[PDB]
Amino acid sequence: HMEGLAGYVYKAASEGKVLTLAALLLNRSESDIRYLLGYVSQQGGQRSTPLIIAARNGHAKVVRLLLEHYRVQTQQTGTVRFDGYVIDGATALWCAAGAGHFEVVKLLVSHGANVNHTTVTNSTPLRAACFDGRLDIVKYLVENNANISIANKYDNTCLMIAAYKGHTDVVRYLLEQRADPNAKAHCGATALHFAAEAGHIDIVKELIKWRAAIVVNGHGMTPLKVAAESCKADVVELLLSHADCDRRSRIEALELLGASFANDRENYDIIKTYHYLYLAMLERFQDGILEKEVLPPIHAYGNRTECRNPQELESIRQDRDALHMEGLIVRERILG
Amino acid sequence: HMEGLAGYVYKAASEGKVLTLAALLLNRSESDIRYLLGYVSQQGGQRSTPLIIAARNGHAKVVRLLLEHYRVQTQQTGTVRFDGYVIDGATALWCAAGAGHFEVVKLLVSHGANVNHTTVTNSTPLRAACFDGRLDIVKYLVENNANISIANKYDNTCLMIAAYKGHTDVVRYLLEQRADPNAKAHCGATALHFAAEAGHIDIVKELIKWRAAIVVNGHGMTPLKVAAESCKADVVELLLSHADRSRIEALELLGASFANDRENYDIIKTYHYLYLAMLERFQDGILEKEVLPPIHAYGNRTECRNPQELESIRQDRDALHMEGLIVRERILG
Numbered sequence: 202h203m204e205g206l207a208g209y210v211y212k213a214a215s216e217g218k219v220l221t222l223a224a225l226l227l228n229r230s231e232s233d234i235r236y237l238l239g240y241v242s243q244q245g246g247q248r249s250t251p252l253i254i255a256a257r258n259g260h261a262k263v264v265r266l267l268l269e270h271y272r273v274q275t276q277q278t279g280t281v282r283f284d285g286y287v288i289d290g291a292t293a294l295w296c297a298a299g300a301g302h303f304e305v306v307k308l309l310v311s312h313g314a315n316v317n318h319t320t321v322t323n324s325t326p327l328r329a330a331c332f333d334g335r336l337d338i339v340k341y342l343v344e345n346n347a348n349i350s351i352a353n354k355y356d357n358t359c360l361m362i363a364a365y366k367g368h369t370d371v372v373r374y375l376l377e378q379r380a381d382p383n384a385k386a387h388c389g390a391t392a393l394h395f396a397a398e399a400g401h402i403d404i405v406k407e408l409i410k411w412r413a414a415i416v417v418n419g420h421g422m423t424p425l426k427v428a429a430e431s432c433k434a435d436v437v438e439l440l441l442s443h444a445d446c447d448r449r450s451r452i453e454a455l456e457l458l459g460a461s462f463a464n465d466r467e468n469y470d471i472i473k474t475y476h477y478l479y480l481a482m483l484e485r486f487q488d489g490i491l492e493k494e495v496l497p498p499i500h501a502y503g504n505r506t507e508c509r510n511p512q513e514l515e516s517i518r519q520d521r522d523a524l525h526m527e528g529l530i531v532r533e534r535i536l537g
Numbered sequence: 538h539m540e541g542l543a544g545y546v547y548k549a550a551s552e553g554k555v556l557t558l559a560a561l562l563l564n565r566s567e568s569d570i571r572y573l574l575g576y577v578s579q580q581g582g583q584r585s586t587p588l589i590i591a592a593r594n595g596h597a598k599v600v601r602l603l604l605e606h607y608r609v610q611t612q613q614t615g616t617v618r619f620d621g622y623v624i625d626g627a628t629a630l631w632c633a634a635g636a637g638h639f640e641v642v643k644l645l646v647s648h649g650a651n652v653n654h655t656t657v658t659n660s661t662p663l664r665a666a667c668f669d670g671r672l673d674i675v676k677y678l679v680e681n682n683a684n685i686s687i688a689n690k691y692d693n694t695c696l697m698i699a700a701y702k703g704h705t706d707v708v709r710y711l712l713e714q715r716a717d718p719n720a721k722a723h724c725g726a727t728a729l730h731f732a733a734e735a736g737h738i739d740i741v742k743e744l745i746k747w748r749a750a751i752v753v754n755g756h757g758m759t760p761l762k763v764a765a766e767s768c769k770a771d772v773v774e775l776l777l778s779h780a781d782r783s784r785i786e787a788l789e790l791l792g793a794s795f796a797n798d799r800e801n802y803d804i805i806k807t808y809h810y811l812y813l814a815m816l817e818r819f820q821d822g823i824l825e826k827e828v829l830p831p832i833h834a835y836g837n838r839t840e841c842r843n844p845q846e847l848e849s850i851r852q853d854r855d856a857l858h859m860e861g862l863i864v865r866e867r868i869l870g
């Protein structure tokens with residue numbers, strides 16, 4: 202059928218050949234043009250229309266022709282491919298936003314594109330831009346009345362995803378536009394919880410400057426202890442210079458922070474494994490005191506047992522091997 | 538007393554001023570030279586002798602003078618500092634081996650240094666040299682009757698530390714010199730367990746030419762599952778070219794490790810080892826798969842029980858990440 206002629210209009214659109222597109226559409230009845238420009242084309246794992254592919258591929262030159270003259274409906278959705286993950290429900294705007302195609306975004310929403318249509322995971326074009334941290338498209342959409350509040354399937358908001366990937370400038374912009382830094386995901390994670398795991402220290406300070414609230418990971422820990430278990434030490438101390446827990450919860454972070462300098466081989470430093478573990482014990486006998494029930498030796502980590510006295514952990518300051526597994530068991534008593 | 542001139546000969550020894558050291562000792566009775574050369578000097582928490590520092594600092598010219606003329610006893614031990622750890626029981630030879638001082642090692646053993654003296658932790662000079670991976674001193678000491686077998690307090694053999702720090706050349710020399718590849722530490726960990734943890738693929742094949750590894754690296758693991766949790770995929774697949782349930786646990790834990798592992802995190806590779814893992818645990822009783830109830834943590838998603846379930850989730854980054862955390866907690870805890 203004219204299914205072959207659709208392949209040609211898709212090919213010209215995907216590769217940005219304005220000259221080819223116009224010559225292909227020039228002498229066509231309106232019935233046929235709506236078929237040609239609305240044809241869902243199977244190319245790889247992408248179900249697309251000429252406009253969606255033209256936008257995903259950043260051929261603004263081609264996108265202009267279709268929206269101005271041939272007046273193509275901007276609400277068309279398809280299933281497109283971004284890197285290695287297939288996304289279904291993607292509109293020309295969402296493809297143009299995720300792929301960071303500056304001009305194409307500005308052209309579609311200027312010609313009336315619904316900036317708040319969502320994929321099946323309910324990622325807005327703004328979220329795509331927040332994931333990749335393209336500041337110009339994040340600024341553009343919000344001042345074009347995009348909804349910073351609409352979040353993904355798992356309540357993971359643009360502010361949360363901007364923090365995990367660490368787009369400091371984008372994160373502060375949304376905070377200024379008064380995005381809620383206390384939203385919670387299906388995980389329970391706050392935007393802070395996320396920035397803590399990835400140690401985006403400047404983002405952590407930005408969120409606090411914008412009256413962010415400390416709340417337990419609804420399904421686990423505090424943002425402090427996710428910093429500790431993630432071993433991001435500078436972050437761990439930042440948060441320990443804001444309202445903490447006297448000795449109690451505060452020392453629990455230090456214990457786990459020093460325990461995380463031990464257990465992961467990537468950033469393993471037994472010197473700071475001891476450094477934090479010892480200072481935790483210091484903050485446990487100050488004035489008054491507060492001890493630890495330790496677990497049996499557990500035939501596994503040899504027969505090492507967790508230290509109960511400062512002098513005890515002092516002894517091991519010469520032994521790498523023992524301090525390393527002292528950390529492995531420190532960690533295992535809080536997590537397990 | 539003569540404590541002031543003793544301080545001076547230590548200074549000359551540590552800084553390698555052979556001529557200066559010699560100028561201090563020449564018109565001294567043999568009684569006095571033993572005080573000067575036997576003084577244990579405290580710098581920090583360090584107990585040192587002029588000979589030990591000359592060896593720790595690799596000043597061969599000074600070490601020759603001391604052993605040759607003034608005939609200083611090679612026995613003599615002290616407490617020295619290295620990578621940041623104060624080590625007790627260190628002899629001039631052991632210091633020179635950790636510090637990779639080629640000649641000073643060659644000079645000390647020639648005048649009778651016990652190549653098998655052990656620190657307080659029972660570290661051979663061979664172990665020290667194996668940690669630093671200096672192959673020339675590893676061969677030299679071995680060809681002068683060093684015992685590849687004498688291990689640290691925790692049964693950690695020279696082969697283990699050569700694997701952990703990843704000195705392929707030291708590992709292959711030790712294996713060719715016929716080191717035991719099946720020793721176990723107090724953890725239970727074999728040399729492979731260590732090579733897997735750090736993913737030293739070339740060494741892992743080297744041990745394969747010989748070995749055969751049991752269980753536990755500290756938590757009841759085979760070297761395969763230590764590779765999986767460490768996310769070392771290439772190692773996991775190398776080791777997956779041998780003999781067997783155990784197969785599915787490795788793939789599951791490796792793919793579950795690509796999620797939580799922010800260091801080498803790839804959500805695509807989570808959905809790959811987890812998908813290929815789905816062969817035969819779930820819907821029988823194939824074999825038995827007890828899934829955990831959807832606990833408030835990884836949201837309330839529940840672990841996939843059928844191949845078809847994991848196919849739907851082939852897309853969605855958010856969803857596959859919590860699928861890894863769920864598998865991880867089921868195999869671990």
Ligand SMILES: O=C(Nc1ccc(F)cc1)c1cccs1
Pocket residue numbers: 283299300320322324328329330332333353854855
């Ligand atoms: O926006 C997202 N993912 C994305 C798309 C395109 C791209 F280039 C980079 C990232 C999403 C996050 C959660 C659901 S969708």
Ligand SMILES: O=C(Nc1ccc(F)cc1)c1cccs1
Pocket residue numbers: 619620624635636656658659660664665668669689
């Ligand atoms: O590994 C050891 N010592 C060492 C390591 C690296 C180095 F550069 C210098 C010395 C050990 C000392 C006691 C037991 S093991």
